[PDB]
From a paper:
Three human ‘MBL-fold’ DNA repair factors, SNM1A, SNM1B (Apollo) and SNM1C (Artemis) are involved in repair of ICLs and DSBs. SNM1A–C have conserved β-CASP and metallo-β-lactamase (MBL) domains. SNM1A/SNM1B are 5′–3′ exonucleases with the unusual capacity to hydrolyse DNA substrates containing lesions, including ICLs. SNM1A has a role in replication-coupled ICL repair, functioning with the endonuclease, XPF-ERCC1, to effectively “unhook” the ICL and allow downstream processing.
The electron density maps reveal both 1 and 2 bind directly to the metal ion(s) via oxygen atoms. Two molecules of 1 were observed in the SNM1A active site, each positioned to coordinate to M1 or M2 via two oxygen ligands giving an octahedral arrangement; precedent for an MBL fold inhibitor binding mode involving two molecules comes from the observation of binding of two rhodanine derived inhibitor molecules at the active site of a true MBL. The molecule of 1 bound to the M2 site is positioned to form a potential hydrogen bond with H994 and to make a water mediated contact with Y184. The aromatic rings of both molecules of 1 stack with each other in a staggered arrangement, with the ring–ring distances between the two 1 rings being 3.2–3.5 Å. The ELF report has the methoxy group of 1 at the meta-position, however, the electron density maps clearly imply that the methoxy substituent is in the para-position for both crystallographically observed molecules of 1. The obtained structures reveal both 1 and 2 (and, likely 3) bind directly to the active site metal ion(s) of SNM1A via two oxygen atoms and likely inhibit in a competitive manner with the DNA substrate, displacing the Zn(ii) ion complexed hydrolytic water/hydroxide that, in models of the reaction mechanism, is positioned for hydrolysis of the phosphodiester bond in the DNA backbone.
Numbering used by the authors: 700 to 1040
The structure:
């Protein structure tokens, strides 16, 4: 049962629809980015063409072992023709390799699928400025006004300052950052840079980062944990028990852990500004939850949609309940009446 919001009308295209078997009529499967809820179903035994960014294609080949004959990477900001239809991939400001897709239908309809994105004013000067867009398939993850969080710049500044202070006060403190999906790499890269260290991680995480075309990555990451003052761990280990366990394995090199858990929005945001964020502490371990989002805030999403002025909006997130659907449609109507389209 492939949902309608993953189908592109007038085409043989689906978007992020790999867990529904052979979709009837689908001649090309697009993947917006390498996140689990979006590539779900893709495996080494997929035998249909997959269209994606170069970075996403690297991850499909090396992490999911999809055969190269079915991986069709496309450059960004470049008009391409897929099965007789003009398409453009645009940077989504989400995770590495994440794209939005512009479809130019033969009948003149223009469709923008945002994939997952964090709307930014720089998108208002992309190839979208040249385009009337009739249908918008919109990442509505945080489509409610209570969803406020700081800029990525502000969050990284807090993380850098917090880590530099803690390690300058105690040179025997270890910094740990939690990760699961790709994305939010700036958190641990910026901290390692201010500490003059490479980032140590597992072989599997190292493999993943090697696929991301990050400039000078070999100067920034390592599998030699002993040489690193900043360690990556699975997000599930970012707790007092998991961190105590990791500290023991470091052989008495460290006597303190400062850990960061990059989250999306938490209602702590509704009460606390980034400068007033405090950690959870138990003994010699402190855990900071930092609101580093790679999705649009409500205000960022509203600004983007009011600039784009689409004729029709199709939400791709929070579609499962009538309450969420009615809430989002109320906001779309508000935005349209305020802006005048
Ligand atoms: C369990 O934590 C996640 C699982 C899946 C995803 C995800 C994302 C952000 C942040 C967290 C997650 C995301 O952007 N996407 O697409 C995902 O699939
Ligand atoms: C199972 O838990 C998730 C599955 C998918 C997603 C997700 C996210 C946050 C937090 C959790 C999840 C998210 O932001 N996005 O985009 C997702 O697709
Ligand atoms: Ni995502
Ligand atoms: Zn997602």
């Amino acid at each position: 049962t492939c949902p309608f919001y993953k189908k592109i009308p007038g085409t043989g295209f689906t978007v992020d629809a790999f867990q529904y078997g052979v979709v009837e009529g689908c001649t090309a499967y697009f993947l917006t980015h390498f996140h689990s809820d979006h590539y779900a179903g893709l495996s080494k035994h997929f035998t249909f063409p997959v269209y994606c960014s170069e970075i996403t294609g690297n991850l499909l080949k090396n992490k999911l072992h999809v055969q190269e004959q079915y991986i069709h990477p496309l450059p960004l900001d470049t008009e391409c023709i897929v099965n007789g239809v003009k398409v453009v991939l645009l940077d989504a400001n989400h995770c590495p390799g994440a794209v939005m897709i512009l479809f130019y239908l033969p009948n003149g309809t223009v469709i923008l699928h945002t994939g997952d994105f964090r709307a930014d004013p720089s998108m208002e000067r992309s190839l979208l400025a040249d385009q009337k867009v009739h249908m918008l398939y919109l990442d509505t993850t945080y489509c409610s006004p209570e969803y406020t969080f700081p800029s990525q710049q502000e969050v990284i500044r807090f993380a850098i300052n917090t880590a530099f202070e803690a390690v300058t006060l105690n040179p025997h403190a270890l910094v740990v950052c939690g990760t699961y999906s790709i994305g939010k790499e700036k958190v641990f890269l910026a901290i390692a840079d201010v500490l003059g260290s490479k980032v140590g991680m597992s072989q599997e995480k190292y493999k993943t980062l090697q696929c991301l075309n990050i400039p000078e990555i070999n100067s920034l990451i390592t599998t030699d944990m002993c040489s690193s003052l900043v360690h990556l761990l699975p997000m599930m280990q970012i707790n007092f028990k998991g961190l105590q366990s990791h500290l023991k394995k470091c052989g008495g090199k460290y006597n303190q852990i400062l850990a960061f858990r990059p989250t999306g929005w938490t209602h702590s945001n509704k009460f606390t500004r980034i400068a007033d964020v405090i950690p959870q502490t138990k003994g010699n371990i402190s855990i900071y939850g930092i609101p580093y989002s790679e999705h649009s805030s409500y205000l960022e999403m509203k600004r983007f949609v009011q600039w784009l002025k689409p004729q029709k909006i199709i939400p791709t997130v929070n579609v499962g309940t009538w309450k969420s659907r009615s809430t989002m449609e109320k906001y779309f109507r508000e935005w349209k009446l305020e802006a005048g389209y």
